[PDB]
């Protein structure tokens, strides 16, 4: 904002900052949800997340890891965390074990500005 | 007073007796903050001149000068027969390079 | 003007706020809406969600949280939530309270009780989503709630926002009254998807037909329980206007997700995945309330198209299990075909539309007839035969060229989506390759060869008029004056295409001429 | 005198769309009467055929759909919408005296392609049309076809052979 | 006719192990429910102190 550079963020990883509200709100008296986590995820990550947004004075190139426990996709910490993203890189077991790297499942991932018209019509 | 006992009067009760309890409040310089039977009335500097203040701001921020205004709509062309006649085929060509500078012209 | 207060707030935690009344002998009813006095300026909304034996009120926050405590007052209004309703929604975003969005009288109400079957009426006219699949095998009609299913990124979204687009060259041209609006409602979607929808509907003109309502992530979980609640309000007042109108939800999961947060939070009794019981009654008040009334009601109607999330294409989750149970068909998704050049990618298996016909115009009832006896042989065919054998029979070639002609970006009109797959059924379309299909069909309907190429023994029929799909809707194609017009135009295209463009294309067999022309058929598939 | 009508539950309806059709006479402009309509289905008094009729009259007869101009405007597809909206949605059919308004505004709109697809529809229907409006139909056709405008000019264009996404101005 | 037996006994194992995964989950939140109320339970005490 103040000095309206462009920004990088990092960040390794989100899956941590869930889980620790998960430890602490049963201990609140909040009643845990499905799998075991917070009923507060969507709305305390949606409010982590939204904050994180290009704007008109500047502009954050963030990156994100994730933590799948079990290489489970279903787990609702990263379910969730769909609809924060543009690009939702996904990596697999089952390519690393291949001996392949970076182990990238081309087809259980994709991104936003995959158009003509933002890029290249050669490269969609 | 005037005020008080005529909102108790409205209240669901009024044969209730009636009993005052004043303050002083470091918030108000103007007005009264009253409250009758759960019915609460505000008359305060801090809230009056806040009403104000905030029609004052959306008359403001309704119109916004930097946009352009809207231009007046434009009816449909109607072209003459006259104009097809002499030139068939140019004719299109200058309603497209027209509504084209229109666009960017 | 005077308020009346109940009490203070006695804990909050997060979203939620419970209760501490003074003057017991006081009440509050079970769903208005509560005022809370944070400072003498500003002033947060509440609903009351629940009641207590010891003189408490459970409340949900919609505004301003963060700037609650512990000891601040509380003030009733005495009525239910309401909203800012009329003609003068059209053109702008809003909060479900009514609070416009910047961007760069009447009051309607969330819970109504939906129109019993008296006040309704069977579903008769069509609602274009502009898409030949659905217009074809699984119609969408007015008054007819149909899900939307599908994981992250396969064309949910794309659906519905076509089917607005589409809506938007018709709505000029016909009266106001059946002019099919429409509302947009988000939920827990990113804000910049919904500013990007906004330029994309400001793009064509579409807004002006066209709202939106946005209870994004950083707003309350109790805010995305009520937003496609004053969605369908809004649609309501359009349906006792005699209007037509249609309502999108994008989408219901984080819905469900926020009801849970809430009964959770307000300590309510769990059950099946951590929902409450009533989750399935949560959106049977809603959909419902998607109908067509009667002509003793104006005959107006509102059309649902709710979009859900599966996970790995799952459909035995609790909602979506629900959501099928009470919509009037559905639509299936899969991520395995929008990644094999079929966009959209539709599963016609699992896809259904219960109203099958009736919905659908006239013209389109002997071209689904067809269709829907070519694809049920071309999946067993394509099933049972192997990949590579070559098989030469009218059906795996007819059928296999419909699907590149599903294949599309944004919406088409009817009277190229009717003289597209008129051409295929009745194998017109067998000579041409796969592969140019689309291209055939960017020459057929935006250009015209017979024309050009001087073949002019066609009276009126031609495809640049574009008016002419109201004849279609009103005689149909199977009339005697359609029928031979539309079979001369179709065969001498045929004929055109075949000796001077599909010859040509064969020849060239080099190496930047392929991408030139690969590029021009892969971008033919988009603006068609 | 009057024919009972039923509802679609067989309720009785009214039919005095008498002062209904004196108020779409009035109507300035042609989407004031589409939502007379409204009105009309909301007193449990639906449209008759000559209140269609009606509509298509003022459709005519009115300069445009409302006050301020609209882009995408046409009389002719907002007739037809009313004409599909009377014979499939409703069940009530037209007479020669309502397709002689659409066959009206056709001639007045010089569409003469539209003009011979509703006189091969009047004439599939066994209906009369009124030789007038042919001639008049007949005369905008060759006077086109004289000068050229039987079609557009960017359909005679002449087509490019390279294969170029430019070329074709997609 | 074997694949068929052994995709019957896999619908089966999925089928139940379904079941269970929505049982097992629903016995975590009462246990998480239970477990708060019964440690939260609040009574008079209406007995004599001095
Ligand atoms: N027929 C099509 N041709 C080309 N691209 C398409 C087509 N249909 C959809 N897309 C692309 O799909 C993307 C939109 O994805 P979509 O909106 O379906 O995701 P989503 O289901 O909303 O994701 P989430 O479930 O996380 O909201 C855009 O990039 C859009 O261009």
Same mark, same amino acid.
């Not at chain 4, 709109?109 to 004439?123: E, N, P, Q, S, T």
């Given at each position: 904002?103040?000095?309206?550079?462009?920004?990088?963020?990092?960040?390794?990883?989100?899956?941590?900052?869930?889980?620790?509200?998960?430890?602490? &709100?049963?201990?609140?008296?909040?009643?845990?949800?499905?799998?075991?986590?917070?009923?507060?995820?969507?709305?305390?990550?949606?409010?982590?997340?939204?904050?994180?947004?290009?704007?008109?004075?500047? &502009?954050?190139? &963030?990156?994100?890891?994730?933590?799948?426990?079990?290489?489970?996709?279903?787990?609702?910490?990263?379910?969730?965390?769909?609809?924060?993203?543009?690009?939702?890189?996904?990596?697999?077991?089952?390519?690393?074990?291949?001996?392949?790297?970076?182990?990238?499942?081309?087809?259980?991932?994709?991104?936003?500005?995959?158009?003509?018209?933002?890029?290249?019509?050669?490269?969609? | =007073?005037?005020?008080?006992?005529?909102?108790?009067?409205?209240?669901?009760?009024?044969?209730?007796?009636?009993?005052?309890?004043?303050?002083?409040?470091?918030?108000?310089?103007?007005?009264?903050?009253?409250?009758?039977?759960?019915?609460?009335?505000?008359?305060?500097?801090?809230?009056?001149?806040?009403?104000?203040?905030?029609?004052?701001?959306?008359?403001?921020?309704?119109?916004?000068?930097?946009?352009?205004?809207?231009?007046?709509? =434009?009816?449909?062309?109607?072209?003459?027969?006259?104009?097809? =006649?002499?030139?068939?085929?140019?004719?299109?060509?200058?309603?497209?390079?027209?509504?084209?500078?229109?666009?960017?012209? | 003007?005077?308020?009346?207060?109940?009490?203070?707030?006695?804990?909050?935690?997060?979203?939620?706020?419970?209760?501490?009344?003074?003057?017991?002998?006081?009440?509050?009813?079970?769903?208005?809406?509560?005022?809370?006095?944070?400072?003498?300026?500003?002033?947060?909304?509440?609903?009351?969600?629940?009641?207590?034996?010891?003189?408490?009120?459970?409340?949900?926050?919609?505004?301003?949280?963060?700037?609650?405590?512990?000891?601040?007052?509380?003030?009733?209004?005495?009525?239910?939530?309401?909203?800012?309703?009329?003609?003068?929604?059209?053109?702008?975003?809003?909060?479900?309270?009514?609070?416009?969005?910047?961007?760069?009288?009447?009051?309607?109400?969330?819970?109504?009780?939906?129109?019993?079957?008296?006040?309704?009426?069977?579903?008769?006219?069509?609602?274009?989503?502009?898409?030949?699949?659905?217009?074809?095998?699984?119609?969408?009609?007015?008054?007819?709630?149909?899900?939307?299913?599908?994981?992250?990124?396969?064309?949910?979204?794309?659906?519905?926002?076509?089917?607005?687009?589409?809506?938007?060259?018709?709505?000029?041209?016909?009266?106001?009254?059946?002019?099919?609006?429409?509302?947009?409602?988000?939920?827990?979607?990113?804000?910049?998807?919904?500013?990007?929808?906004?330029?994309?509907?400001?793009?064509?003109?579409?807004?002006?037909?066209?709202?939106?309502?946005?209870?994004?992530?950083?707003?309350?979980?109790?805010?995305?329980?009520?937003?496609?609640?004053?969605?369908?309000?809004?649609?309501?007042?359009?349906?006792?206007?005699?209007?037509?109108?249609?309502?999108?939800?994008?989408?219901?999961?984080?819905?469900?997700? #926020?009801?849970?947060?809430?009964?959770?939070?307000?300590?309510?009794?769990?059950?099946?995945?951590?929902?409450?019981?009533?989750?399935?009654?949560?959106?049977?008040?809603?959909?419902?309330?998607?109908?067509?009334? #009667?002509?003793?009601?104006?005959?107006? #109607?509102?059309?649902?198209?709710?979009?859900?999330?599966?996970?790995?294409?799952?459909?035995?989750?609790?909602?979506?299990?629900?959501?099928?149970?009470?919509?009037?068909?559905?639509?299936?998704?899969?991520?395995?075909?929008?990644?094999?050049?079929?966009?959209?990618?539709?599963?016609?298996?699992?896809?259904?539309?219960?109203?099958?016909? #009736?919905?659908?115009?006239?013209?389109?009832?002997?071209?689904?007839?067809?269709?829907?006896?070519?694809?049920?042989?071309?999946?067993?065919?394509?099933?049972?035969?192997?990949?590579?054998?070559?098989?030469? /029979?009218?059906?795996?070639?007819?059928?296999?060229?419909?699907?590149?002609?599903?294949?599309?970006?944004?919406?088409?009109?009817?009277?190229?989506?009717?003289?597209?797959?008129?051409?295929?059924?009745?194998?017109?379309?067998?000579?041409?390759?796969?592969?140019?299909?689309?291209?055939?069909?960017?020459?057929?309907?935006?250009?015209?060869?017979?024309?050009?190429?001087?073949?002019?023994?066609?009276?009126?029929?031609?495809?640049?008029?574009?008016?002419?799909?109201?004849?279609?809707?009103?005689?149909?194609?199977?009339?005697?004056?359609?029928?031979?017009?539309?079979?001369?135009?179709?065969?001498?295209?045929?004929?055109?295409?075949?000796?001077?463009?599909?010859?040509?294309?064969?020849?060239?067999? /080099?190496?930047?001429?392929?991408?030139?022309?690969?590029?021009?058929?892969?971008?033919?598939?988009?603006?068609? | 005198?009057?024919?009972?009508?039923?509802?679609?539950?067989?309720?009785?309806?009214?039919?005095?769309?008498?002062?209904?059709?004196?108020?779409?006479?009035?109507?300035?402009?042609?989407?004031?009467?589409?939502?007379?309509?409204? *009105?009309?289905?909301?007193?449990?008094?639906?449209?008759?055929?000559?209140?269609?009729? +009606?509509?298509?009259?003022?459709?005519?007869?009115?300069?445009?759909?409302?006050?301020?101009?609209?882009?995408?405007?046409?009389?002719?597809?907002?007739?037809?919408?009313?004409?599909?909206?009377?014979?499939?949605?409703?069940?009530?059919?037209?007479?020669?005296?309502?397709?002689?308004?659409?066959?009206?505004?056709?001639?007045?709109?010089?569409?003469?392609?539209?003009?011979?697809?509703?006189?091969?529809?009047?004439?599939?229907?066994?209906?009369?049309?009124?030789?007038?409006?042919?001639?008049?139909?007949?005369?905008?056709?060759?006077?086109?076809?004289?000068?050229?405008?039987?079609?557009?000019?960017?359909?005679?264009?002449? +087509?490019?052979?390279?294969?170029?996404? *430019?070329?074709?101005?997609? | 006719?074997?694949?068929?037996?052994?995709?019957?006994?896999?619908?089966?194992?999925?089928?139940?192990?379904?079941?269970?995964?929505?049982?097992?989950?629903?016995?975590?939140?009462?246990?998480?429910?239970?477990?708060?109320?019964?440690?939260?339970?609040?009574?008079?005490?209406?007995?004599?102190?001095?």
């Amino acid at each position: 904002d103040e000095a309206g550079q462009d920004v990088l963020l990092f960040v390794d990883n989100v899956f941590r900052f869930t889980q620790a509200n998960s430890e602490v &709100s049963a201990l609140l008296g909040r009643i845990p949800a499905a799998v075991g986590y917070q009923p507060t995820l969507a709305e305390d990550l949606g409010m982590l997340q939204e904050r994180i947004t290009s704007t008109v004075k500047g &502009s954050i190139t &963030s990156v994100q890891a994730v933590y799948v426990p079990a290489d489970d996709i279903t787990d609702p910490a990263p379910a969730t965390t769909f609809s924060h993203l543009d690009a939702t890189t996904v990596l697999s077991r089952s390519v690393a074990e291949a001996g392949i790297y970076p182990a990238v499942e081309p087809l259980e991932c994709a991104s936003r500005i995959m158009d003509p018209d933002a890029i290249d019509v050669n490269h969609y | =007073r005037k005020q008080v006992e005529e909102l108790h009067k409205e209240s669901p009760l009024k044969d209730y007796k009636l009993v005052l309890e004043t303050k002083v409040d470091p918030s108000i310089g103007g007005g009264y903050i009253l409250e009758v039977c759960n019915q609460v009335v505000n008359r305060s500097a801090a809230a009056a001149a806040a009403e104000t203040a905030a029609l004052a701001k959306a008359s403001a921020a309704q119109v916004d000068w930097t946009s352009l205004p809207a231009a007046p709509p =434009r009816p449909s062309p109607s072209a003459p027969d006259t104009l097809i =006649r002499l030139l068939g085929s140019v004719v299109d060509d200058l309603a497209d390079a027209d509504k084209v500078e229109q666009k960017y012209g | 003007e005077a308020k009346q207060k109940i009490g203070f707030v006695h804990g909050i935690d997060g979203t939620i706020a419970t209760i501490a009344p003074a003057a017991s002998k006081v009440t509050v009813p079970y769903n208005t809406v509560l005022e809370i006095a944070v400072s003498a300026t500003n002033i947060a909304n509440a609903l009351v969600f629940n009641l207590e034996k010891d003189g408490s009120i459970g409340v949900i926050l919609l505004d301003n949280i963060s700037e609650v405590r512990s000891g601040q007052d509380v003030y009733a209004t005495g009525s239910l939530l309401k909203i800012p309703v009329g003609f003068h929604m059209l053109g702008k975003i809003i909060n479900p309270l009514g609070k416009e969005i910047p961007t760069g009288t009447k009051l309607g109400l969330v819970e109504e009780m939906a129109p019993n079957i008296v006040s309704r009426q069977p579903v008769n006219y069509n609602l274009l989503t502009g898409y030949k699949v659905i217009d074809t095998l699984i119609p969408v009609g007015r008054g007819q709630r149909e899900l939307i299913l599908g994981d992250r990124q396969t064309g949910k979204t794309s659906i519905a926002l076509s089917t607005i687009l589409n809506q938007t060259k018709v709505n000029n041209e016909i009266l106001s009254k059946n002019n099919v609006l429409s509302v947009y409602v988000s939920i827990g979607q990113r804000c910049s998807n919904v500013a990007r929808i906004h330029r994309l509907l400001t793009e064509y003109d579409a807004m002006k037909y066209c709202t939106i309502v946005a209870a994004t992530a950083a707003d309350p979980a109790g805010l995305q329980y009520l937003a496609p609640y004053a969605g369908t309000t809004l649609g309501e007042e359009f349906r006792n206007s005699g209007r037509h109108i249609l309502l999108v939800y994008d989408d219901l999961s984080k819905q469900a997700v #926020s009801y849970r947060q809430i009964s959770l939070l307000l300590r309510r009794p769990p059950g099946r995945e951590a929902y409450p019981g009533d989750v399935f009654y949560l959106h049977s008040r809603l959909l419902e309330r998607s109908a067509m009334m #009667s002509p003793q009601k104006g005959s107006g #109607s509102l059309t649902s198209l709710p979009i859900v999330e599966t996970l790995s294409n799952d459909v035995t989750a609790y909602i979506v299990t629900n959501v099928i149970s009470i919509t009037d068909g559905q639509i299936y998704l899969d991520a395995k075909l929008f990644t094999g050049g079929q966009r959209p990618a539709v599963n016609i298996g699992l896809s259904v539309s219960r109203v099958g016909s #009736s919905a659908q115009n006239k013209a389109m009832k002997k071209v689904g007839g067809a269709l829907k006896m070519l694809m049920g042989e071309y999946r067993k065919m394509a099933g049972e035969q192997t990949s590579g054998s070559q098989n030469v /029979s009218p059906v795996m070639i007819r059928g296999a060229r419909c699907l590149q002609l599903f294949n599309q970006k944004g919406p088409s009109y009817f009277m190229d989506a009717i003289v597209a797959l008129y051409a295929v059924t009745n194998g017109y379309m067998d000579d041409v390759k796969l592969q140019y299909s689309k291209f055939y069909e960017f020459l057929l309907l935006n250009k015209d060869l017979p024309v050009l190429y001087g073949q002019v023994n066609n009276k009126y029929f031609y495809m640049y008029n574009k008016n002419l799909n109201y004849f279609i809707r009103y005689f149909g194609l199977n009339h005697e004056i359609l029928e031979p017009e539309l079979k001369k135009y179709i065969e001498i295209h045929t004929n055109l295409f075949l000796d001077n463009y599909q010859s040509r294309m064969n020849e060239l067999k /080099s190496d930047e001429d392929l991408v030139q022309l690969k590029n021009l058929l892969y971008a033919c598939k988009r603006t068609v | 005198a009057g024919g009972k009508r039923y509802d679609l539950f067989g309720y009785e309806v009214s039919v005095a769309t008498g002062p209904f059709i004196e108020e779409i006479k009035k109507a300035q402009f042609y989407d004031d009467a589409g939502e007379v309509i409204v *009105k009309m289905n909301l007193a449990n008094t639906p449209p008759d055929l000559q209140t269609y009729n +009606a509509v298509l009259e003022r459709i005519l007869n009115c300069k445009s759909k409302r006050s301020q101009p609209v882009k995408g405007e046409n009389k002719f597809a907002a007739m037809m919408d009313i004409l599909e909206e009377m014979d499939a949605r409703s069940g009530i059919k037209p007479n020669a005296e309502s397709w002689g308004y659409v066959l009206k505004e056709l001639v007045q709109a010089g569409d003469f392609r539209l003009g011979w697809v509703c006189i091969a529809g009047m004439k599939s229907l066994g209906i009369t049309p009124d030789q007038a409006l042919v001639d008049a139909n007949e005369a905008n056709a060759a006077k086109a076809k004289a000068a050229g405008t039987d079609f557009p000019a960017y359909l005679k264009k002449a +087509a490019p052979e390279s294969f170029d996404t *430019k070329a074709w101005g997609i | 006719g074997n694949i068929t037996g052994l995709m019957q006994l896999a619908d089966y194992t999925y089928n139940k192990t379904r079941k269970e995964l929505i049982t097992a989950e629903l016995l975590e939140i009462i246990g998480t429910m239970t477990a708060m109320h019964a440690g939260k339970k609040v009574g008079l005490k209406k007995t004599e102190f001095w």
